[PDB]
Design a protein around this motif. Structure first.
Motif, PDB file in Angstrom:
ATOM      1  N   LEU A 135     -31.551 -19.921 -40.217  1.00 52.77           N
ATOM      2  CA  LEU A 135     -31.337 -20.878 -41.229  1.00 52.77           C
ATOM      3  C   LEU A 135     -30.810 -20.122 -42.498  1.00 52.77           C
ATOM      4  O   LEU A 135     -31.468 -19.139 -43.003  1.00 52.77           O
ATOM      5  N   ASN A 136     -29.524 -20.164 -42.798  1.00 55.63           N
ATOM      6  CA  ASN A 136     -28.699 -19.345 -43.589  1.00 55.63           C
ATOM      7  C   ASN A 136     -28.949 -19.633 -44.991  1.00 55.63           C
ATOM      8  O   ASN A 136     -29.252 -20.832 -45.604  1.00 55.63           O
ATOM      9  N   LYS A 137     -28.378 -18.769 -46.097  1.00 53.94           N
ATOM     10  CA  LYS A 137     -28.816 -18.682 -47.565  1.00 53.94           C
ATOM     11  C   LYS A 137     -28.371 -19.797 -48.194  1.00 53.94           C
ATOM     12  O   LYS A 137     -28.905 -20.475 -49.087  1.00 53.94           O
ATOM     13  N   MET A 138     -26.865 -20.279 -47.965  1.00 51.04           N
ATOM     14  CA  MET A 138     -26.232 -21.294 -48.730  1.00 51.04           C
ATOM     15  C   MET A 138     -26.415 -22.643 -48.189  1.00 51.04           C
ATOM     16  O   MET A 138     -26.305 -23.766 -48.890  1.00 51.04           O
ATOM     17  N   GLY A 139     -27.132 -22.954 -46.991  1.00 49.44           N
ATOM     18  CA  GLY A 139     -27.211 -24.071 -46.270  1.00 49.44           C
ATOM     19  C   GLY A 139     -28.163 -24.890 -46.485  1.00 49.44           C
ATOM     20  O   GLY A 139     -28.148 -26.177 -45.967  1.00 49.44           O
ATOM     21  N   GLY A 140     -29.051 -24.706 -47.465  1.00 49.05           N
ATOM     22  CA  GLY A 140     -30.013 -25.559 -48.029  1.00 49.05           C
ATOM     23  C   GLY A 140     -31.090 -25.040 -48.800  1.00 49.05           C
ATOM     24  O   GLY A 140     -30.883 -23.865 -48.748  1.00 49.05           O
ATOM     25  N   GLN A 141     -31.712 -25.813 -49.674  1.00 46.80           N
ATOM     26  CA  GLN A 141     -33.152 -25.308 -50.352  1.00 46.80           C
ATOM     27  C   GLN A 141     -34.328 -25.314 -49.704  1.00 46.80           C
ATOM     28  O   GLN A 141     -34.873 -24.276 -49.722  1.00 46.80           O
ATOM     29  N   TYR A 142     -34.360 -26.264 -48.570  1.00 53.31           N
ATOM     30  CA  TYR A 142     -35.281 -26.093 -47.541  1.00 53.31           C
ATOM     31  C   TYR A 142     -35.235 -25.954 -46.113  1.00 53.31           C
ATOM     32  O   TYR A 142     -34.018 -25.747 -45.798  1.00 53.31           O
ATOM     33  N   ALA A 143     -36.431 -25.564 -45.243  1.00 55.72           N
ATOM     34  CA  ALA A 143     -36.317 -25.952 -43.935  1.00 55.72           C
ATOM     35  C   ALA A 143     -37.028 -26.947 -43.451  1.00 55.72           C
ATOM     36  O   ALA A 143     -37.815 -27.352 -44.318  1.00 55.72           O
ATOM     37  N   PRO A 144     -37.215 -27.490 -42.295  1.00 56.69           N
ATOM     38  CA  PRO A 144     -38.060 -28.480 -41.857  1.00 56.69           C
ATOM     39  C   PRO A 144     -39.368 -27.747 -41.785  1.00 56.69           C
ATOM     40  O   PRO A 144     -39.454 -26.517 -41.093  1.00 56.69           O
ATOM     41  N   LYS A 145     -40.529 -28.293 -41.947  1.00 57.58           N
ATOM     42  CA  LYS A 145     -41.785 -27.695 -41.748  1.00 57.58           C
ATOM     43  C   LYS A 145     -42.527 -28.403 -40.559  1.00 57.58           C
ATOM     44  O   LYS A 145     -42.546 -29.642 -40.546  1.00 57.58           O
ATOM     45  N   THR A 146     -42.764 -27.765 -39.642  1.00 60.33           N
ATOM     46  CA  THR A 146     -43.287 -28.145 -38.452  1.00 60.33           C
ATOM     47  C   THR A 146     -44.834 -29.215 -38.579  1.00 60.33           C
ATOM     48  O   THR A 146     -45.469 -28.809 -39.275  1.00 60.33           O
ATOM     49  N   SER A 147     -44.499 -30.073 -37.715  1.00 59.75           N
ATOM     50  CA  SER A 147     -46.080 -30.727 -37.753  1.00 59.75           C
ATOM     51  C   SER A 147     -46.706 -29.881 -37.114  1.00 59.75           C
ATOM     52  O   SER A 147     -46.461 -28.965 -35.918  1.00 59.75           O
ATOM     53  N   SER A 148     -48.048 -30.017 -37.128  1.00 59.44           N
ATOM     54  CA  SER A 148     -49.206 -29.550 -35.980  1.00 59.44           C
ATOM     55  C   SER A 148     -49.182 -29.921 -34.721  1.00 59.44           C
ATOM     56  O   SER A 148     -48.565 -30.957 -34.461  1.00 59.44           O
ATOM     57  N   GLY A 149     -49.427 -29.080 -33.696  1.00 59.08           N
ATOM     58  CA  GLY A 149     -49.059 -29.341 -32.278  1.00 59.08           C
ATOM     59  C   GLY A 149     -48.852 -28.449 -31.407  1.00 59.08           C
ATOM     60  O   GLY A 149     -49.763 -27.492 -31.814  1.00 59.08           O
ATOM     61  N   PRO A 150     -48.163 -28.503 -30.270  1.00 61.66           N
ATOM     62  CA  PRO A 150     -48.237 -27.255 -29.174  1.00 61.66           C
ATOM     63  C   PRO A 150     -48.203 -25.995 -29.687  1.00 61.66           C
ATOM     64  O   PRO A 150     -48.910 -25.122 -28.923  1.00 61.66           O
ATOM     65  N   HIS A 151     -47.619 -25.296 -30.513  1.00 61.99           N
ATOM     66  CA  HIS A 151     -47.585 -23.934 -31.009  1.00 61.99           C
ATOM     67  C   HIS A 151     -47.628 -23.640 -32.353  1.00 61.99           C
ATOM     68  O   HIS A 151     -47.324 -24.529 -33.176  1.00 61.99           O
ATOM     69  N   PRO A 200     -34.013 -23.063 -58.496  1.00 60.59           N
ATOM     70  CA  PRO A 200     -34.106 -21.565 -58.195  1.00 60.59           C
ATOM     71  C   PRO A 200     -32.445 -21.247 -58.620  1.00 60.59           C
ATOM     72  O   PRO A 200     -31.742 -21.980 -58.881  1.00 60.59           O
ATOM     73  N   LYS A 201     -32.025 -19.583 -58.611  1.00 60.84           N
ATOM     74  CA  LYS A 201     -30.932 -19.583 -58.799  1.00 60.84           C
ATOM     75  C   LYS A 201     -30.155 -19.373 -57.501  1.00 60.84           C
ATOM     76  O   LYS A 201     -30.671 -19.154 -56.546  1.00 60.84           O
ATOM     77  N   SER A 202     -28.950 -19.128 -57.659  1.00 55.23           N
ATOM     78  CA  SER A 202     -28.136 -18.938 -56.318  1.00 55.23           C
ATOM     79  C   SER A 202     -28.276 -17.434 -55.530  1.00 55.23           C
ATOM     80  O   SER A 202     -28.417 -16.407 -56.356  1.00 55.23           O
ATOM     81  N   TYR A 203     -28.289 -17.560 -54.451  1.00 53.49           N
ATOM     82  CA  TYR A 203     -28.689 -16.545 -53.675  1.00 53.49           C
ATOM     83  C   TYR A 203     -27.313 -15.621 -53.120  1.00 53.49           C
ATOM     84  O   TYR A 203     -27.315 -14.881 -52.398  1.00 53.49           O
ATOM     85  N   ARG A 204     -26.252 -16.218 -53.511  1.00 45.95           N
ATOM     86  CA  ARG A 204     -24.996 -15.528 -53.559  1.00 45.95           C
ATOM     87  C   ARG A 204     -25.189 -14.363 -54.105  1.00 45.95           C
ATOM     88  O   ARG A 204     -25.238 -13.970 -55.297  1.00 45.95           O
ATOM     89  N   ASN A 205     -24.438 -13.149 -53.440  1.00 44.58           N
ATOM     90  CA  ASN A 205     -24.489 -11.765 -54.027  1.00 44.58           C
ATOM     91  C   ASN A 205     -23.326 -11.568 -55.026  1.00 44.58           C
ATOM     92  O   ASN A 205     -22.417 -12.175 -54.897  1.00 44.58           O
ATOM     93  N   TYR A 206     -23.215 -10.571 -55.706  1.00 45.99           N
ATOM     94  CA  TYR A 206     -22.060 -10.046 -56.213  1.00 45.99           C
ATOM     95  C   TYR A 206     -22.127  -8.454 -56.668  1.00 45.99           C
ATOM     96  O   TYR A 206     -23.330  -8.012 -56.978  1.00 45.99           O
ATOM     97  N   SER A 207     -21.001  -7.645 -56.873  1.00 43.51           N
ATOM     98  CA  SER A 207     -21.220  -6.249 -56.936  1.00 43.51           C
ATOM     99  C   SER A 207     -20.175  -5.790 -57.879  1.00 43.51           C
ATOM    100  O   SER A 207     -18.998  -6.247 -57.621  1.00 43.51           O
ATOM    101  N   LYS A 208     -20.212  -4.699 -58.614  1.00 44.82           N
ATOM    102  CA  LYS A 208     -19.436  -4.247 -59.412  1.00 44.82           C
ATOM    103  C   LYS A 208     -18.383  -3.084 -58.689  1.00 44.82           C
ATOM    104  O   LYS A 208     -18.895  -2.689 -57.704  1.00 44.82           O
ATOM    105  N   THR A 209     -17.139  -3.164 -59.024  1.00 49.30           N
ATOM    106  CA  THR A 209     -16.012  -2.274 -58.323  1.00 49.30           C
ATOM    107  C   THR A 209     -15.717  -1.074 -58.946  1.00 49.30           C
ATOM    108  O   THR A 209     -15.005  -0.399 -58.442  1.00 49.30           O
ATOM    109  N   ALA A 210     -16.139  -0.528 -60.206  1.00 53.80           N
ATOM    110  CA  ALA A 210     -15.612   0.345 -60.822  1.00 53.80           C
ATOM    111  C   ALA A 210     -16.555   1.008 -62.214  1.00 53.80           C
ATOM    112  O   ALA A 210     -17.516   0.519 -62.347  1.00 53.80           O
ATOM    113  N   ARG A 211     -16.364   2.205 -62.301  1.00 51.40           N
ATOM    114  CA  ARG A 211     -16.951   2.984 -63.411  1.00 51.40           C
ATOM    115  C   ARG A 211     -16.055   4.104 -63.926  1.00 51.40           C
ATOM    116  O   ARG A 211     -15.000   4.534 -63.197  1.00 51.40           O
TER     117      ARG A 211
END
Lengths: 257, 171, 185
Positions: A19-35, C1-12
């Motif tokens: 589950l990717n960073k930008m793709g949501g605030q949450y994930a689904p939380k599993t029901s109690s069950g098989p595993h 919460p804050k954005s989890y998108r990264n950012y980085s400086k390119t120079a000094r």
RNA sequence: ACGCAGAAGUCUCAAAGUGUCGGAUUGUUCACCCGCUAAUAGGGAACGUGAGCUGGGUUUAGACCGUCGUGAGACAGGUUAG
RNA sequence: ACUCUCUUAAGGUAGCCAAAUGCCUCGUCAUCUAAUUAGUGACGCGCAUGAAUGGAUUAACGAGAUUCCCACUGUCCCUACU
RNA sequence: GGAAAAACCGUAAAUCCUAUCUUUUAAAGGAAGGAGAAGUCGUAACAAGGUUUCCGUAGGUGAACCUGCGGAAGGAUCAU
RNA sequence: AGCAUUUGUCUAAAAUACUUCCAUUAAUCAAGAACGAAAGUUAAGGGAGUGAAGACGAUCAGAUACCGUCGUAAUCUUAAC
RNA sequence: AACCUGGUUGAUCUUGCCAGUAGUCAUAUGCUUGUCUCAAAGAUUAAGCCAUGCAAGUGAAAGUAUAUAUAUAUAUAUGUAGAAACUGCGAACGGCUCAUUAAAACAGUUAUAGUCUACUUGACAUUUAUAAGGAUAACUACGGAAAAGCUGUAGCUAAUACUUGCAUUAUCCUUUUGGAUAAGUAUUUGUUAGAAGGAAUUAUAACAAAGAAGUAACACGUAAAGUGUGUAUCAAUCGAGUUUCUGACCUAUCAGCUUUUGAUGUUAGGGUAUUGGCCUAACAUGGCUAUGACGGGUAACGGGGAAUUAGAGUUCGAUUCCGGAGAGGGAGCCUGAGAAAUAGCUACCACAUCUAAGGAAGGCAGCAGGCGCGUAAAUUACCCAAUUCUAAAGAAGAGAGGUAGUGACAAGAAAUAACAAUGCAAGGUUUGUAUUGGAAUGGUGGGAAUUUAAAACCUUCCCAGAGUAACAAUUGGAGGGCAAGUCUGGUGCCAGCAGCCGCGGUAAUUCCAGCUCCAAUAGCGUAUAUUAAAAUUGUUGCAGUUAAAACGCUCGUAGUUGAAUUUCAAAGAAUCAUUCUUUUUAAAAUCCGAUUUUGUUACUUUGAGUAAAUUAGAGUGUUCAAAGCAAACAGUUAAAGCAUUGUGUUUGAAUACUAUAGCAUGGAAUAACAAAAUUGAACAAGCUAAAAUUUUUUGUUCUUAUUUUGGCUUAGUUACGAUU
């Protein structure tokens, strides 16, 4: 005040999920069950994020509300119901059968299983209890009770198990020379054969496992699942078969295709 | 209840932190006296029920030599191991020595042996005299304040002698 | 919460900013390669320093180490793809060997000048900013675009530009010239 | 009566019918504050009132410090005890 | 400060204060009060403080002189009964 | 069975009295330190600085200081 | 720190010598303790000479200093510090 | 980027500081801002206060409809919708802040054989019968109060609200069959027997007593004998309480603390969900302390982590994830599986609102917005489309969450022209650079395509549309430090500037202007904080004769440091007079002449078990880059592949750090430690008291003895036994 936490954040949720960073605030939380939570997939993840049979959670709900999908011969509309390490999903409408297996990248994958062979699964017992009248019940990795089991079977044995009757086809004694699958720990998502067992007293039992590249490594006993025999693998593994290529070998192999 | 407000292991003093929670837990002591059966159900965490006996008179007393049990009234509380206050005030606890009516046990012995399953090895004369005069000493063993009943065992020999000396310059 | 998108400086800018020799060399780099800022050199310096640091890590590590052979093969492959390394340049001393003009040479404005599409690097910069180039049939307006080795053969003028003959850019002015000439004649 | 619009208030006449206090500081008349008030007016009676009291002060004899006096001592100088 | 000087013998040093010692004076500033000719700590051109005429400071001690706070109360409000 | 109300142990807020610690913060008046302007009085230190110097110390001084006592040279003596 | 007459007594000390004994007992040491010039303090002697204080004569621009003469405390011993 | 210049002097070398200089997801402020993508944002100051609004609800196969609506059948029947209301379930999560709390909370690491656990999941039950018993809400009426989420009577009537209750298995006889007898899951007591775990008072089995709760009087509907809701016990799961070990900032101008009063142990109880001085009684007199207890401080929540880092380090961690704390202050409860909840309640104190002044109700450190505080911080916007959560779970809700608005916090990308002529400049017919004059281009204004919850932005297309491209780039400097003027006037130790050195007191290169030059650039000054700089806190890695610094001197406990000494070696093989590797060379114990074992720790090696984000780092042309976790490939509108025209394909979403402690683990060296002569222990022999074996009479009991094994006393015997 205090009690049951009902949410699972995106970052907090298992890396196994993908589950990717930008793709949501949450994930689904599993029901109690098989595993256990860390050791399972819910139907939402399986339908949308693995299979991609739905765009959204609403499209998953549209699939689920219908009578079309049945797991363990049981129709389910339950979104966060957990499907565990190894069992058989049947989707009636598309005529599809999937068996759940570990990937080599340490994530759960649905591996296509034959229509006849969908009948059975291979099931590890975790504990076996004597109840009133000195009457057995086995307790499985997938949280099932198997009542009335023969005393020949022991507490780490695997058993081939019908899904229609829910009972045993055959059984495999836990031993050296048995094909084993690692389910947690450092060596998670790999298959080997048990090279040697050495008892540890009052502390973690460790088991020595050999790969099919003839390489030997240790693993903790709790998280090794017997999966076949030296004579044969007992179930349909995916093509990779739990075998470890190192990154340089794997990337060169990928390039040389 | 809580221990964190008490003194540190060094003897040191620790500041008060964390406001009191439900599940630290602890409630008023049992007061159980001699009188007709009356009990209040107490609701513990998770819906776990306890039975608070407030009065009882007839408990389940065990004759341990044949291993058999009958329900019998307690005539009096006579000695308490923990303190003298509880026995004088007449409040039962699991190391009270009480006096029980000997008649169900006496009937059972008569029925089984034919003079006064079964071992049939003959009761000791001091204890037998006590059974005859109805002054039978017994020790409480259940916790009435938790389980709703005060159940016990008939004492004998060394336990009998020790508690008799405990019960009563001078001698 | 804050954005989890990264950012980085390119120079000094390194300490002693009035280092005469450094200043003069940088000015010549700006002049020669059509740069707008010392910051352009500093980003190229950051890339070179990243290369130097990687190369140091590789050359300090021994032969027959998994991290070393994986990272080294990967770096060399990537540098070949970017077009930094020559034909037999496949060893760590050539990775150290890299220089700031060579990195600058990978820029699209430099290539556009080199191919002769524009008559100067600065002219090439403006040509690219004014939306007239294509790389493999993709328009790009960025003068600091770094051209890969395969990409170099595929650089031409945009077919949707006036240079590509699709329409004049100043339809108004071209129309005015036609209309005025037809009215007078 | 008014420089009295009202409200205040001021000058004033017949008027002693009626009232004119709680405290702080003082040996004190006087004084000087604070508070209430309707206003907290002014005076006489052997400086109202020691066989009514009180005895704090001035003002017996003891004592103390200062000044003044060679001194004894002095001091409408201060102070304690009578 | 430093220098000089007249007078006279030398011209108040360490300290100290409106003190039982500051006329003027109920001196000026704080503080204590509700109001402070009182109390205290200060200040100190001191009518007229000051070094065995002893100056300065003190615990223990006091039928000592004095101020204040608590406790206690018919001293008093305001007397009444015995 | 059962409301109000009381009584008994037990939690125990809050309040007040002390006791100790903590923190700022007020105050007449005292007594220090520094900064400034080419200030007054000496001529102390720097050369043997016109009494070699400094140290410890004690007592004196309008001071800067001086004198005594016992050290050192960081002395002007590393030489009968 | 400090220690110079004579003789004696009570004491310690280092090096040398050793085909003598021990058999690691050591090194440097917060805490704590010992000894610790000169002067000072307090008590007894002693108070020769020297001599903080102090006193005079000069000296000098002034000199409360150097210099001269006198001179108490101190210097010395015993006992404490 | 493993680094330095300028400043004590007449000149010098040093010590030593000051100054420059660079960074800071670290704040403020000054000036400037033609653009685009990206996106921190009332913590630091008051855990100070809040106007108004909203932030937690829930009904599409399956509890309750004579308010009502509606389609069929002979007013009435079936049915289907249905405001409302009882019922059920949730609101204990999330969001917010960090006052606290300094061995506590927290982190790694245990333990729970000391326990509890709803929903969910899988096992699955034992002491009037064609199917029960009413009573209560909404509802009808009369009413009361200024006001209120105030509520009073009486009549009803349902539930999945509430209360009951209706033959089954095993053992003994018969022999399969046919008879007889019994019959409580948790939980508790008393007696025993005793699958698995290292370990058992555990599973389990029997006995004698008690003993909950229970096991459907509920709702739908599969023929091209099905389902929902709900129920005791058991296990799982989502968790939780405890609990082991190890780990902390500053302070001695804090050295003894703790014990009436549980301090510390023991015993007995009680309480608790359970262990527990958790609480009470009785008995001990302890316990803790320089390896810094006990106090006191902190601008102290803890951690993952952030900054700077050549290597060490040093500073920082309200603040996107995790754990804790807290909801004005304390305290106390109720409800429920879960709360000592605070959009739960009650009281007190601190606040504080409406009142008709009788009384009534209240809690922004939820989201907006306001006030106060301050040097300091955005909109009472729109939406549930995505992400998830809550329900009777599809279709409804959600200030959780998203989307905008405000945004020079930070970060990426990027204009402010290009070009050809002439004229000018140098160079041999070249290169370089005040006049003209045609092409190109965005910003800016509009329409669409598009994008979207919708709207806006983006992109695309089409219109419009620069010559002083006025469609106007700024900041700070130009003696040195330090890149740029012995440039022009005016002021005249004044005004003033200037981190620092300095300039200015009359022919100013430092001021005030002007001109030119220079640096960086849509950003650059300034201040405060913090790192490098600084081998100026020094393990690496300082300095102590004279610059700062050897305690006056010596002993001495804690502390740190503490000589040599013990199994050397040999030969082979592999490999480029080197290198990696294998074999054998005492003794004891053990097993079939041979086979295989032999001190503890420090240190070290492999490992096991490690949350992501971040960080390093691979894959991957976001239009490049900051980024993201995706993508790539063939095909005008198809073949291939595999299935008996259906069906795209290859995939990717890596690898690693992830205490120092703990756990497993190989070890020869080096260290430690143990073993280690006022005589010790290894063995053979004999004597001796204990237990067991073999014997052996007495009917469901029961004698004795030889013998065998272990313990102990005594003369001998070992290569017998002490390093310098």
């Amino acid at each position: 005040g205090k009690g049951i936490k009902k949410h699972l954040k995106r970052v907090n949720a298992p890396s196994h999920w993908m589950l990717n960073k930008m793709g949501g605030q949450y994930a689904p939380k599993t029901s109690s069950g098989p595993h256990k939570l860390l050791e399972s997939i819910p139907l939402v993840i399986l339908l949308r994020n693995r299979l991609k049979y739905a765009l959204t959670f609403d499209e998953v709900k549209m699939i689920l509300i219908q009578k079309i999908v049945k797991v363990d011969n049981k129709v389910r509309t339950d979104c966060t119901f957990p499907v565990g390490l190894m069992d058989v999903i049947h989707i009636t409408k598309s005529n599809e059968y999937f068996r759940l297996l570990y990937d080599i990248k340490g994530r759960f994958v649905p591996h296509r299983i034959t229509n006849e062979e969908s009948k059975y699964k291979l099931c590890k017992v975790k504990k076996i209890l004597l109840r009133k009248g000195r009457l057995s019940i086995a307790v499985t990795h997938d949280g099932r009770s198997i009542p009335y089991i023969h005393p020949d079977v022991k507490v780490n044995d695997t058993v081939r198990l019908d899904l229609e009757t829910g009972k045993v086809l055959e059984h495999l004694k836990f031993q050296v020379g048995s094909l084993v699958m690692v389910t947690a720990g450092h060596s998670v998502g790999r298959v080997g054969v048990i090279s040697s067992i050495d008892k540890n007293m009052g502390t973690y039992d460790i088991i020595h496992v050999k790969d099919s590249r003839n390489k030997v490594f240790a693993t903790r006993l709790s998280n090794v699942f017997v999966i076949g025999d030296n004579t044969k693998p007992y179930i349909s593994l995916p093509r990779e078969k739990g075998i470890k290529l190192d990154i340089i070998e794997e990337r060169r192999n990928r390039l040389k295709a | 209840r809580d221990g964190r407000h008490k003194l540190r292991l060094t003897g040191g003093k620790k500041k008060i932190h964390k406001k009191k929670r439900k599940y630290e837990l602890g409630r008023p002591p049992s007061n159980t006296k001699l009188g007709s059966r009356q009990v209040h159900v107490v609701r513990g965490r998770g819906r776990n029920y306890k039975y608070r006996a407030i009065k009882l008179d007839s408990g389940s007393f065990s004759w341990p030599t044949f291993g058999i049990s009958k329900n019998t009234r307690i005539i009096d509380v006579v000695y308490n191991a923990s303190n003298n206050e509880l026995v004088r005030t007449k409040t039962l606890v699991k190391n009270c020595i009480v006096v029980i009516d000997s008649h169900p046990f006496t009937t059972w012995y008569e029925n089984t042996f034919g003079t006064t399953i079964g071992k049939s090895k003959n009761i000791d004369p001091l204890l037998l005299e006590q059974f005859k005069q109805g002054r039978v000493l017994a020790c409480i063993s259940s916790r009435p304040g938790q389980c709703g009943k005060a159940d016990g065992y008939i004492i004998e020999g060394d336990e009998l002698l020790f508690y008799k000396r405990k019960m009563d310059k001078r001698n | 919460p804050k954005s989890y998108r990264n950012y980085s400086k390119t120079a000094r800018n390194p300490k002693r900013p009035f280092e005469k020799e450094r200043l003069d060399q940088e000015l010549k780099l700006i002049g020669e390669y059509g740069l707008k800022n010392k910051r352009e050199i500093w980003r190229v310096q950051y890339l070179l320093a990243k290369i130097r640091s990687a190369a140091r890590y590789l050359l300090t590590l021994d032969e027959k180490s998994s991290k070393r052979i994986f990272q080294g093969e990967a770096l060399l492959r990537r540098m070949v793809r970017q077009g930094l390394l020559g034909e037999n340049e496949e060893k760590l001393d050539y990775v150290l060997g890299l220089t700031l003009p060579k990195l600058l040479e990978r820029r699209l404005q430099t290539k556009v000048f080199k191919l002769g599409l524009a008559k100067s690097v600065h002219h090439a910069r403006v040509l690219i900013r004014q939306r007239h180039i294509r790389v493999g049939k993709q328009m790009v307006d960025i003068p600091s675009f770094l051209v890969r080795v395969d990409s170099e053969k595929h650089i031409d003028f945009a077919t949707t530009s006036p240079f590509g003959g699709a329409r004049p850019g100043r339809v108004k002015r071209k129309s005015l010239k036609k209309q005025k000439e037809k009215t007078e004649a």
